[PDB]
Amino acid sequence: SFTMRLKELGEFGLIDLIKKTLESKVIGDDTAPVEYCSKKLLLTTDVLNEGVHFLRSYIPEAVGWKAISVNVSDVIANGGLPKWALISLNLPEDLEVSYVERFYIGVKRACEFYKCEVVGGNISKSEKIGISVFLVGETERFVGRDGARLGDSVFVSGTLGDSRAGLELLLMEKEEYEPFELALIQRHLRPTARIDYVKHIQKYANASMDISDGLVADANHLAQRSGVKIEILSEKLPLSNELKMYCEKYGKNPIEYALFGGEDYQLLFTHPKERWNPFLDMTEIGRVEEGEGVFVDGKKVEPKGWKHF
Amino acid sequence: TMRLKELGEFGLIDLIKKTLESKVIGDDTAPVEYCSKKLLLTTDVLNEGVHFLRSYIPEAVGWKAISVNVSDVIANGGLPKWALISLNLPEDLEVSYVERFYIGVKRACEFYKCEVVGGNISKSEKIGISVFLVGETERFVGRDGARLGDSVFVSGTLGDSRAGLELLLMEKEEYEPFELALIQRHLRPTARIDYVKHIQKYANASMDISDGLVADANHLAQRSGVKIEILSEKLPLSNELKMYCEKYGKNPIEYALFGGEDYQLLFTHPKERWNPFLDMTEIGRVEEGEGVFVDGKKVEPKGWKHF
Ligand SMILES: Nc1ncnc2c1ncn2[C@@H]1O[C@H](COP(=O)(O)OP(=O)(O)CP(=O)(O)O)[C@@H](O)[C@H]1O
Ligand SMILES: Nc1ncnc2c1ncn2[C@@H]1O[C@H](COP(=O)(O)OP(=O)(O)CP(=O)(O)O)[C@@H](O)[C@H]1O
Ligand SMILES: Cc1ncc(C[n+]2csc(CCOP(=O)(O)O)c2C)c(N)n1
Ligand SMILES: Cc1ncc(C[n+]2csc(CCOP(=O)(O)O)c2C)c(N)n1
Ligand SMILES: [Mg+2]
Ligand SMILES: [Mg+2]
Ligand SMILES: [Mg+2]
Ligand SMILES: [Mg+2]
Ligand SMILES: [Mg+2]
Ligand SMILES: [Mg+2]
Ligand SMILES: [Mg+2]
Ligand SMILES: [Mg+2]
Ligand SMILES: [Mg+2]
Ligand SMILES: [Mg+2]
């Protein structure tokens, strides 16, 4: 047999093939805009698979919180507010009910914090834990990742690389972790969607999305969709103290974690610096110019990222 | 230490409802108020080795993915509008499989009149298809409003999907014309979007028969607080089923009451409200308080349980 597999096709070839097979024009952003009653509902889905996004050994509460968060992150990144959610679960017959009870308590906590509601879902048995959450968002103004203008400044929220450091910390399987380390582990396990940026993005963002697979990588989605070149400056990337602590203590380059670190779930949006709002952890990292691709310090850059295939 | 298999499917739903302190959870769709009318939210999953096999024709699976979920929307008087697809795919799955799957999905959407606007992807060891569907209705019809004196109706025929399944599991060299018909009804269910209007106007309670009549009748019985009386001799049996039952020495009634995945509707309303143009069949009547009985006796459900 010589017929092509997904491994050979790659995630981006897969995505393009589905879009083309569906002949859909509404698709390529973090959510799917859909007009309704003059307003625009934002639809999005996300999965967390055991062994792929988390391990059964993790604290279920954190996974339930995260299952909602990463999804709220997509709704927020396009300028919308989370409303209703559905959860589709693949659970092994031998799973502890306490794991599921606790998981949902994490779900409840997140929804109460993001102010959305889990109105239903689905159950099915399976070999391993599968968590698929669907989210419905409401928004006055949709903000894709294609409207970036030239000259615009490139801003990110929070700090980067923390999550990748937290994941490596989790893999060490230590019995005890130092306070700064738990902070990082914290960011990987219970990420928090920047739902506090809705107002801002929805009003002053020309283009926006959330960093989920790594800055450099997702930056390419932005550049491509909009049709510009992304000029990023490493020594302007918001780094974390605990991240620097982890890097000092373990011998790694912080920059390396901020450019190619995943699951940070911060935002990536562009707009005129004249629209900057100092009352938010906003951090300009680069500029939108003519050309194509993403340049870190005026250079190539692989890039590296997550990619399932 | 307590596992999911010991809790049971109803127990797991119960626990989730209580833990989420939810009011909406309870029937086929999730009724949501949004600008005059209500939106209907629902999701269904197809897992490899659980709902289908990798050998099955991929376009049929794509179709079923959409149908099974439309079935829940229709079942509550709504119409399909937007769908999202979350896929778990093994790195070795052939590209043609995903392409053919999306063809069956493409045309399922053209048939039901809904568009797929996005979804998700992830590496995985087994194919997993989680569909999210958003539909809309002018009048939500759940499964708690059955009135005493209402007549109990189902659409099409029952027990076909289970037989089609069994035929597939036999892995015969080749099948008879009728065995292909049954295998088809199992591989390619067809949501009853042609009943939307009848449910929306005249049904008091409604739902689709995904796990089996007797088992799903309970949800309705329990949800409406009534007692559902069913008569086996009134259950609609297709000709292909009778032919299959005859040939393998099986009782058609057993397949009608416990056969799953037929995706027909089960709804109640005054007998007079009966619409002869659609293929509905009265099978029982709504009596007073608790239970689901068949020919007098209170048969114990044998529907498909996940736990
Ligand atoms: N993991 C989950 N999280 C939240 N709600 C869930 C859920 N799994 C199931 N539910 C909800 O519980 C209710 C019903 O389960 P029930 O088994 O009677 O039917 P169903 O509507 O799920 C169709 P089917 O059973 O054929 O897949 C639904 O209203 C659904 O939204
Ligand atoms: N199986 C599938 N079917 C249909 N659309 C899909 C899909 N998998 C992904 N998509 C769609 O393709 C587009 C984007 O993929 P992209 O990888 O850039 O981001 P994402 O929105 O999926 C968020 P993240 O990667 O952080 O989960 C989206 O508009 C999404 O709806
Ligand atoms: C067990 C385990 N191994 C590795 C990682 C790293 N990781 C996995 S998926 C992902 C991006 C997810 O988003 P999406 O699903 O949208 O691709 C990242 C950074 C992890 N979290 N857990
Ligand atoms: C390999 C294999 N073994 C058995 C069956 C039968 N079956 C599985 S799930 C189900 C109900 C599904 O709806 P839900 O997922 O809502 O429970 C039925 C009738 C099958 N299709 N494939
Ligand atoms: Mg994203
Ligand atoms: Mg995802
Ligand atoms: Mg996402
Ligand atoms: Mg990704
Ligand atoms: Mg990406
Ligand atoms: Mg149902
Ligand atoms: Mg289901
Ligand atoms: Mg269903
Ligand atoms: Mg079921
Ligand atoms: Mg059921």
Curated annotation (Swiss-Prot), chain B:
<dbReference type="GO" id="GO:0009228">
    <property type="term" value="P:thiamine biosynthetic process"/>
</dbReference>
<keyword id="KW-1015">Disulfide bond</keyword>
<protein>
    <recommendedName>
        <fullName>Thiamine-monophosphate kinase</fullName>
        <ecNumber>2.7.4.16</ecNumber>
    </recommendedName>
</protein>
<feature type="binding site">
    <location>
        <position position="28"/>
    </location>
    <ligand>
        <name>Mg(2+) 3</name>
    </ligand>
</feature>
<comment type="pathway">
    <text>Cofactor biosynthesis; thiamine diphosphate biosynthesis; thiamine diphosphate from thiamine phosphate: step 1/1.</text>
</comment>
<feature type="binding site">
    <location>
        <position position="72"/>
    </location>
    <ligand>
        <name>Mg(2+) 4</name>
    </ligand>
</feature>
<keyword id="KW-0547">Nucleotide-binding</keyword>
<feature type="binding site">
    <location>
        <position position="51"/>
    </location>
    <ligand>
        <name>substrate</name>
    </ligand>
</feature>
<comment type="similarity">
    <text>Belongs to the thiamine-monophosphate kinase family.</text>
</comment>
<feature type="binding site">
    <location>
        <position position="72"/>
    </location>
    <ligand>
        <name>Mg(2+) 3</name>
    </ligand>
</feature>
<keyword id="KW-0808">Transferase</keyword>
<dbReference type="InterPro" id="IPR006283">
    <property type="entry name" value="ThiL-like"/>
</dbReference>
<dbReference type="GO" id="GO:0009229">
    <property type="term" value="P:thiamine diphosphate biosynthetic process"/>
</dbReference>
<feature type="binding site">
    <location>
        <position position="208"/>
    </location>
    <ligand>
        <name>Mg(2+) 3</name>
    </ligand>
</feature>
<feature type="binding site">
    <location>
        <position position="102"/>
    </location>
    <ligand>
        <name>ATP</name>
    </ligand>
</feature>
<keyword id="KW-0460">Magnesium</keyword>
<feature type="binding site">
    <location>
        <position position="43"/>
    </location>
    <ligand>
        <name>Mg(2+) 1</name>
    </ligand>
</feature>
<dbReference type="Pfam" id="PF00586">
    <property type="entry name" value="AIRS"/>
</dbReference>
<feature type="binding site">
    <location>
        <position position="120"/>
    </location>
    <ligand>
        <name>Mg(2+) 1</name>
    </ligand>
</feature>
<feature type="binding site">
    <location>
        <position position="28"/>
    </location>
    <ligand>
        <name>Mg(2+) 4</name>
    </ligand>
</feature>
<dbReference type="InterPro" id="IPR036676">
    <property type="entry name" value="PurM-like_C_sf"/>
</dbReference>
<feature type="binding site">
    <location>
        <position position="72"/>
    </location>
    <ligand>
        <name>Mg(2+) 2</name>
    </ligand>
</feature>
<keyword id="KW-0479">Metal-binding</keyword>
<dbReference type="InterPro" id="IPR036921">
    <property type="entry name" value="PurM-like_N_sf"/>
</dbReference>
<dbReference type="InterPro" id="IPR016188">
    <property type="entry name" value="PurM-like_N"/>
</dbReference>
<keyword id="KW-0418">Kinase</keyword>
<dbReference type="GO" id="GO:0009030">
    <property type="term" value="F:thiamine-phosphate kinase activity"/>
</dbReference>
<dbReference type="GO" id="GO:0005524">
    <property type="term" value="F:ATP binding"/>
</dbReference>
<feature type="binding site">
    <location>
        <position position="210"/>
    </location>
    <ligand>
        <name>ATP</name>
    </ligand>
</feature>
<feature type="binding site">
    <location>
        <position position="261"/>
    </location>
    <ligand>
        <name>substrate</name>
    </ligand>
</feature>
<dbReference type="GO" id="GO:0000287">
    <property type="term" value="F:magnesium ion binding"/>
</dbReference>
<feature type="binding site">
    <location>
        <position position="44"/>
    </location>
    <ligand>
        <name>Mg(2+) 1</name>
    </ligand>
</feature>
<keyword id="KW-0784">Thiamine biosynthesis</keyword>
<feature type="binding site">
    <location>
        <position position="211"/>
    </location>
    <ligand>
        <name>Mg(2+) 5</name>
    </ligand>
</feature>
<comment type="subunit">
    <text>Homodimer.</text>
</comment>
<feature type="binding site">
    <location>
        <position position="304"/>
    </location>
    <ligand>
        <name>substrate</name>
    </ligand>
</feature>
<feature type="binding site">
    <location>
        <position position="143"/>
    </location>
    <ligand>
        <name>ATP</name>
    </ligand>
</feature>
<keyword id="KW-0067">ATP-binding</keyword>
<feature type="binding site">
    <location>
        <position position="42"/>
    </location>
    <ligand>
        <name>Mg(2+) 4</name>
    </ligand>
</feature>
<feature type="binding site">
    <location>
        <begin position="119"/>
        <end position="120"/>
    </location>
    <ligand>
        <name>ATP</name>
    </ligand>
</feature>
<feature type="binding site">
    <location>
        <position position="44"/>
    </location>
    <ligand>
        <name>Mg(2+) 2</name>
    </ligand>
</feature>
<comment type="function">
    <text>Catalyzes the ATP-dependent phosphorylation of thiamine-monophosphate (TMP) to form thiamine-pyrophosphate (TPP), the active form of vitamin B1.</text>
</comment>
